[PDB]
């Protein structure tokens, strides 16, 4: 499949690491509509100050999903981590077998394309 | 003192209409990603333009800030800053007695870039008041 | 409120002409390398130069911005502004009725350097409007 | 010089009124989180505007500065400033003898942004004095 | 309980570390009101200068307790580390099995909300 | 061949690396025109913000091909890995056994020579 | 508009004499130590000075630069400027009809400091043109 | 003594290193007045330039005392180290078993409290 | 320049008064924590303001610098400034011959914020002289 | 321009006086701890303040820098600038015939802060010439 | 040969690495004129931007020449790394057994010293 | 004498390292006048750019001798390293058993004290 001797290992690695790390995610909307995909979720904390004191601390979710099942995902769609609701804001290029998936929160913001 | 009175009066003038927002007075704010779109009111400047021979007649800057999540299109900010907040404050009788004059100055935007968490729009008023 | 009407009026006139470009209106943009050359239009400033005793008569700056990939020669960009936008705003009856007066101010260039992904040219129009 | 008693003079006035704060004089300050809200007095500028053929008649800026804990809302600072300082600094018999003229300039706010241990209200005065 | 065969592992580790260092404390006011919470307390340093020099050396308390107890806390509520009192200022997002608690000192400053 | 007794070692290294890593690529246009060469592909992600929000994130592909076959390549030439077309923007100077190949994407922009 | 030919005409007006330099039009350049000392032509500014009530009469700035490697003494830069570029362009009838009025502004030096990869001398002109 | 199992363990850690490292300190003046405290002394370097050349090279002494015996040291009080004398400037809060003492040199500067 | 004797003249006058300080002239300084409070004198500016069509009549600026340990309260800084510098230098006959006019400008304070070994008080003078 | 000739003329005027220093023309410099105390001559500015409707009448600025080891006291710099540079160029027939008017502009000091490897004194003149 | 008990090791150490890693560069012109030195050469990449886009990507050759045979190499004279032509820019001070030799390319620029 | 049990150890270590790495250093002038010491000389290289571009290459010699002799050394006096003659610019405060010695080169510049 790949003239690597190496990608097959890391591709196998991704299934194993997601086999042990991360949770399944239920996608809504988009073209995939309802589907279940396995990925690792982490939400590092971020905080901005803006003016004098306008601390708006939050977080930036990430998913690190396998590349094959995230094709034709686009941006306007939304996800669900169990009870929680997420919407994809940006995808990442594949590192060889997987790509980080960046999530927002709440409803996706408008469309603003025309 | 007028700043506490002034800030109190304007936020009440805003709240009379339909809700939909938080009304953080003062300055420390602290929002978190649940108390979104909200409005902040504060003052800056407060110099001593003499301008008169009977009273200090200070002047200051009144700031109206509306905060929206991250990268929402500015269209609603235009609607919010022009329709939601501008016409209502255009004539507040409490302020007219409270202050000497009110003048509109600024209409700005500021998008968060680092981590792009928020989006703020600034409405600036210059106030001539005597305390 | 005029900005949405103003933004829509110009972009639709731009959209009315030959295609070949995305027409991201407002601010958030977010391109990726699939929706290339695209045009962005937005407003800034909008202060309160009084200048008129019967109406407020503000004025703001209108931006027309178009993005090109990295090291595309400026000749194309110079061609692009002429071939696409600049002659169209010479006569647009839509916004002419909408606003009071509007003149050109400048036309510049800039580009990314670190990782050089994008390259852009902006059109600045000073517009005078009453709201 | 006049500065030492000048700093002493205002310190007497504020300490004469009701306390509620430490009065670290001059500039070294160094607080730690034990001696909160407190005030300080110092001078800046001190140039040689001639203005007078027979006397040097220098002038300088006077700072009355009060620090408050971190993110306390400005209302406390507003109340603190316009009650505990501005009325007090209205007129002091000692100051009139020491200096020629006493003029107010303005007052602003600022605070520790990173970490955020303190908030500060600064009042700036203008003193013209003869050596 | 946790569909990762890892969360139980790390959470159990969280029980050990909190049990093996960082004492216990109790809550004052707030929804939890009287309740005893064990975490890990520490106090780094932080110095600001403001003007010509206004060095205001202070501290920065942190707790790092598991999230389940610290639910419905908000910010105005107080607490005490034994003999010494504090008040919650910021709650970090869930790491996966716990979160950090950032404390002030003395009385919480006003409300200034409406 | 190399007066170092070590370049011979590093030469076997690079071939081993290219053998066990990366893939083969086909160059289009240029003096080499249609030719097949094997390299190691890697595409780190990059974000650019420009104005307020103008996030235009893209990619920075690289090849790291051995020096011998990459000679007289110039820059205008294009390249294809797998099923997608690229084009070289800059060639790193030889390290001693190989060099990194910086690949653009799509059509190379004009020439703008004279 | 006329930007493409204006650069084209002047660069062709340069090439009439001996070669020995690249004549990179516009901006992208990209030199490497193989196409060395060369010249670049581009324009900036492009304002809308009125100056006239019949047509736009735009005004921009004309940039002509030359690049030399590392720490070659500026004597070459001076000699290159005073001979290779400055005299020939002083009368080029090709752009005489293409423009309205031309005026020189100044001549500057700026060279790489870190690793000294190059050394650049910039000649700058102000151009009034009826776009 | 404390519900840690670790601090009491590290309490043993500090006393031995304070015995093994550093010297004794003969504090003078202050509420402690005559007392002897063990600690570890070190004097790193610091050069400030101010104007064009105004190099004012000096040092920033540190002591790392144990907080139990140095309570209510306050700030103006001085201290004699061996044959030479210093004056304390900052007392850091305890890390859990001890803290850091930041020393000035020569006489303490004034008071300037009122 | 004549700065050699000019600095020499003022330094002697200061040395004529009570000692208690190192009297570094010029620039290099280099203190170490044993030669504390000391005084430094140097010059800047020194342009060719002509204002006299018979002789060059340059004008320069004089810095009088005194440095104190760390966070000593500014009370003594003013006391040192008012007692050790301003009066003695106000009237020195030796200076009168060497220059044409001496004018005071102002004096401020700075201090080492990071680390914080030193505190600086400067006095600035403008000198008119012929050479 | 005539820059090479003017720099050669002033350099030869300096070299005629008793030597002891390197005489670097241009700007590459490169000193090392062997060519110390030395001088360099160069030109900046080079504008087209036309000012005259007969010829270009360009105006430039002349830099004469003198470099001394590290932290030598400024007395040596004063002596250098007063003895070897300022008087010697006060009347040079070569440059008198070369340019139209030459005016003294400024003279100042600056020494390396980080690693303090050098201390330079700059003497700057303004020159008007015709090319 | 020197009061080191340490350099003798580094002296032989230098010869070993130069022999095991390095090229037989030949010097042309200069007071040394025709001579040959074994040195370990490298070409790290350095790129400047200048204006908007003026990428001037180039190399910064280094040689790591032993001090003893590099004396009075001066600066102006050229240099040849085998079939390629260079010219020394500056000489580093001896680190104890050698010095980094910095190379330009092409004709050295002028003299400009009189 | 060293009431720490660690200062004696580091003193032995410093003596051994100075014996195994250091070199002789004969000093001239100063209160010690003719005196011979042993120190671990080194000289890092530094560059500066004075203007649009002026490369002033230099060195920052250091010695790191034991503290017992560098007492009453002041700053004006000079010293010789083998055949080369330097002068002490700065003396670092004692590290516990020694101190660094920063040197200039050539004749020390003037005095300019009073």
Summarize the structure.
This is part of a larger assembly, with 6 copies of chain A (114 residues) and 6 copies of chain B (131 residues). Chain A is α+β, with helices and mostly antiparallel strands and 114 residues long.
Overall description:
The structure is cut from a larger assembly and holds 6 copies of chain A (114 residues) and 6 copies of chain B (131 residues). Chain A is an alpha+beta fold and 114 residues long. Chain A has one helix at residues 7-20; strands spanning 23-28, 35-39, 45-46, 58-59, 65-66, 78-81, 84-91, 98-99, 101-103. Chain A has a single domain, classed as Beta Barrel (Thrombin, subunit H). Chain A contains 1 helix and 9 strands, in the order αβββββββββ. The relative contact order of chain A is 0.19. Chain B is of the alpha+beta class. Chain B has 4 helices and 4 strands; from the N terminus they run αββαααββ. In chain B, 26% of the residues lie in helices and 32% in strands. The interface between A and B is medium-sized, with 19 and 24 residues. Chains A, E, F, H, K, L: One of its GO terms (biological process) is virion assembly. Chains A, E, F, H, K, L: One of its GO terms (cellular component) is virion component.
């Amino acid at each position: 499949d790949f003239d690597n001797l190496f990608d097959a290992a890391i591709a196998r690695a991704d299934e194993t690491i997601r086999g042990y790390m991360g949770t399944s995610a239920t996608i809504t909307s988009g073209e995939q509509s309802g589907a279940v995909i396995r990925g690792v979720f982490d939400d590092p904390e971020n905080i901005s100050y803006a003016g004098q004191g306008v601390r708006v601390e939050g977080s930036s979710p990430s998913l690190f999903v396998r590349t094959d099942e995230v094709r034709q995902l686009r941006r306007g769609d939304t996800l669900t981590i169990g009870e929680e609701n997420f919407w994809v804001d940006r995808v990442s290029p594949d590192d060889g077998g997987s790509c980080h998936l960046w999530l927002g929160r709440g409803v996706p913001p408008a469309v603003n394309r025309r | 003192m007028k700043h506490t009175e002034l800030r109190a009066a304007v936020l009440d003038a805003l709240e009379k209409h339909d809700t939909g927002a938080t009304f953080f007075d003062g300055r420390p704010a602290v929002f978190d990603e649940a108390d979104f779109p909200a409005v902040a009111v504060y003052l800056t400047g407060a110099e001593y333009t003499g301008e008169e021979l009977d009273s200090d007649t200070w002047q200051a800057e009144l700031h109206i800030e509306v905060f929206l999540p991250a990268q929402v299109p500015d269209s609603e900010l235009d609607a919010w800053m022009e329709s939601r907040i501008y016409p209502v404050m255009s004539d507040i009788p409490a302020l007219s007695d409270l202050i000497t004059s009110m003048v509109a100055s600024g209409y700005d935007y500021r998008r968060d870039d680092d981590a792009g968490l928020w989006s703020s729009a600034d409405l600036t008023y210059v106030i001539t008041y005597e305390m």
